[PDB]
From a paper:
The mammalian SLC13 proteins are members of the larger divalent-anion sodium symporter ([name]) family. [name] proteins typically have a molecular weight of 45–65 kDa and form obligate homodimers. Each protomer consists of a scaffold and a transport domain. Structural information, along with cross-linking and computer modeling, indicates that [name] proteins operate in an elevator-type transport mechanism (Reyes et al., 2009; Drew and Boudker, 2016; Garaeva and Slotboom, 2020).
Finally, to obtain clear density of substrate in the binding site of [name], we crystallized the protein in complex with sodium and terephthalate, and solved the X-ray structure to 3.92 Å resolution by molecular replacement. With two carboxylate moieties at approximately the same distance as those of native substrates, we hypothesized the terephthalate would bind within the [name] binding site, while its large benzene ring would provide stronger electron density than succinate, fumarate, or malate. In the transport domain, the two carboxylate moieties of the bound substrate are coordinated by two conserved Ser-Asn-Thr (SNT) motifs, which also form part of the Na+-binding sites Na1 and Na2.
Author numbering:
A (entry chain D), B (entry chain C): 18 to 462
């Protein structure tokens, strides 16, 4: 009776159809049928992303592709645990309030100017998003933005409160492209091609440094009237208490080890997934230093995304085991040889940068990263490029709300019009397809 | 400065000490030192049970016992997922309120007699604990018990209102011994020795059927004055609404497949961990039938216990890989050959039935199930008996509060005295050491 129950029944139909009617070797048929089923279920979201994630292995198992335990072992990939480490580190500095003090101390560095207010609100929302989350950084910044934009309260003077709102809703998403913790897509790419933390930082941090100015510029050079106004610094100030310095010390030490993981590990006996060990060590320090309780981390952690990761890796392996990756490589051979690698990575970047407006950031990465990384592997090219590209572009949702939670968080402020966002995002999208295809060309040799 | 920070530093000391001073082959030294370390950390709970669980693999990995991915793969054992299935099934019937309707419908079957009120309160707390939880069943029953024991309000007539509180807090723990879902210890045993759902039911359900009467009898023939009183059925009645019949249908179907798993699976192609597939199927049906949302399952699920399961299996494998199981088997060879299997399982049943009063039921199972199962395996005896025994006896916490959450839940009713419980529990413990050593002898050939 409900829309989604219908999308589900239509997808079951589509599967049965493709299964019986496709004229290929059985394994390719099964792999294609499964790929389509999941693709639909994840783009429509008729079932929750996490339930479809759980649906992947139970199919693999019933259709004999894998044995139950082999299929489940995917959900314990080391990147999943690294991400759980970043979740506990965020839980820590939130329960401790080190995000509030990092907001105030930087925000009150601007003495009383709305000019240098919003610029620090974006630089903070971004710097905080590198480590915490996106939905969380945006929902945490919203009160500080509405707090600042209350002196210029005139909402007949609207264009101030869209520049300063959409700015943070974008600064959180751009800040999520800086490190392996931040947005799930990065983790799905890292799990697919086997990236370390410092590897994905060598990629994403440059792209974030470039895209945050370009995005503020684009919001600016629409309708910005904010070189005027004054500050209302209204609330109790902050002060470093029972080891907010401890939370900082652990955080700092952890991020240090994450950056210098390559030489420390090489000069330690070369452990297997050093970054994951560091993340679990973080959880341990944070628990021994008494600084955060487990109930906190259990609330903060989005276990549904951790299950998603696994479902995505399982899908990748289903495509390999069934040969659907080699089959699609053969089917695209003539197209990719008639196109350039420029053309290709432009088509990819565009396709995702716009698909992410209609569907979930992570659902889109979870679908496209496997397919592309595995086809690229069937072409015998290093899948890193396509995977990182897709993962970055999936976090470039700027048009309508519903694209990402930050958009619908700053949108529910009953002020910003649908059309305004729909056309600033339409400019920033092309801007990114540009910046991305550029950098992806420079990171070649 | 804090108690637990000291317990931790003293345990790190104990480890370093045992490590340097024990005079055995290096692997046995490392395995023993680790066993002691974890043992302490889990019995004292200086760190949260789940943080110790995470501590097990990071040690195994740094001390070269396993590779990071091998050690982590333990956290994706199929029993973990079966338990997550039972968590989603509980989330479903709680969010749906089918536990309230099952309480009301049975409670209002007793017309107006306090005699047949408390007896049905115990039969319900027990039947519900089979599937839901223990801490949860107790906290959900407390308002219904205080609701009934409000007509006999006289708390100078205390021993009525203590009998029914301790009564239900015991019916929850005994009901937790009936099925693989219920109490984690059962799941840790099932994960260690490889039990199916219908296997652990063939064991525990008899024991619960026996132990619930014996426990009501023992509470009765202390100070029971309840053949008097009348009922106050005060609250809005219940009625089967938007598919509480659906939730019932799925529940029933799931439990049916779990019971009949052996022939269905044999007559299906013999899938590997069928019960786990049934549990994930439950999560899927419950999501397609729209009957429960994922946010609900994410709140209900105790992800910390699911991580514990894994850490405990990892410990077991550390004992095997280091040969500490064979070493302790050799060290106990003369003791166990000078003892009978009666003597042995009496010492075990006693030891745990009383250790479980001082430390967490599941922390106790996670520690003792590995050590014992693996030593029994070095003696080449089927480890099932000792493991199931330990798991049942660990759920036989009846004395002080703090033993189990149900005890401390009915204890916080600012009414039941410390001494009263300490001596009903002191009788019920021996009663169990009896019943258990008995049944454990009958289940031999
Ligand atoms: O799929 C989505 O819509 C999505 C999920 C998570 C995040 C994040 O917190 O980084 C952003 C977007
Ligand atoms: O470790 C404990 O004290 C304990 C944990 C869980 C349960 C349960 O809900 O079955 C009972 C007791
Ligand atoms: Na982030
Ligand atoms: Na999106
Ligand atoms: Na139970
Ligand atoms: Na206990």
């Amino acid at each position: 009776l409900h829309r989604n129950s219908l999308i589900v029944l239509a997808d079951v139909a589509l599967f049965l159809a493709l299964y019986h009617f496709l004229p290929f070797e059985h394994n390719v048929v099964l792999g294609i049928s499964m790929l389509a089923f999941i693709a639909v279920l994840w783009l429509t979201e008729a079932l929750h992303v996490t339930v479809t994630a759980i649906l992947v292995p139970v199919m693999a198992v019933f259709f004999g592709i894998f044995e139950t335990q082999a299929a489940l072992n995917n959900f314990a990939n080391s990147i999943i645990f690294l991400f759980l480490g970043g979740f506990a580190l965020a839980a820590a500095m939130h329960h401790q309030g080190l995000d509030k003090v990092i907001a105030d101390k930087v925000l009150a560095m601007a003495q009383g100017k709305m000019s240098v207010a919003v610029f620090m609100l974006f630089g903070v929302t971004a710097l905080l998003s590198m480590w915490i989350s996106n939905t969380a950084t945006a929902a945490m910044m919203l009160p500080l933005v509405l707090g600042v934009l209350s002196k210029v309260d005139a909402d007949k003077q609207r264009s101030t409160y869209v520049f300063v709102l959409l700015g943070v809703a974008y600064s959180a998403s751009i800040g999520g492209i800086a490190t392996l913790v931040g947005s799930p897509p990065n983790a799905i790419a890292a799990a697919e091609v086997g990236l370390s933390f410092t590897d994905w930082m060598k990629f994403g941090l440059p792209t974030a440094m470039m895209m945050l100015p370009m995005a503020i510029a684009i919001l600016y050079f629409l309708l910005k009237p904010t070189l005027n106004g004054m500050f209302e610094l209204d609330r109790a100030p902050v002060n470093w208490d029972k080891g907010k310095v401890v939370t900082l010390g652990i955080f700092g030490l952890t991020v240090f080890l994450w950056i210098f993981s390559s030489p420390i590990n090489a000069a330690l006996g070369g452990f297997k997934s050093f970054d994951t060990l560091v993340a679990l060590g973080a959880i341990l320090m944070l628990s021994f230093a008494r600084v955060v309780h487990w109930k906190e981390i259990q609330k903060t952690a989005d276990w549904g995304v951790l299950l998603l990761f696994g479902g995505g890796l399982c899908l990748s392996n289903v495509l390999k085991q069934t040969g659907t990756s080699v089959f699609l490589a053969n089917a695209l051979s003539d197209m990719v040889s008639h196109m350039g690698i420029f053309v290709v990575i432009l088509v990819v970047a565009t396709f995702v940068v716009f698909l992410t407006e209609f569907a979930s950031n992570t659902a889109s990465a979870a679908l496209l990263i496997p397919v592309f990384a595995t086809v690229a592997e069937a072409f015998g090219m290093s899948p890193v490029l396509l995977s990182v590209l897709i993962a970055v572009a999936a976090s470039c949702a700027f048009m309508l709300p519903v694209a990402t939670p930050p958009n619908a968080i700053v949108f529910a402020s009953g002020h910003i019009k649908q059309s305004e966002m729909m056309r600033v995002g339409l400019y920033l999208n092309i801007a990114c397809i540009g910046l991305l295809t550029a950098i992806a060309m420079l990171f070649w040799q």
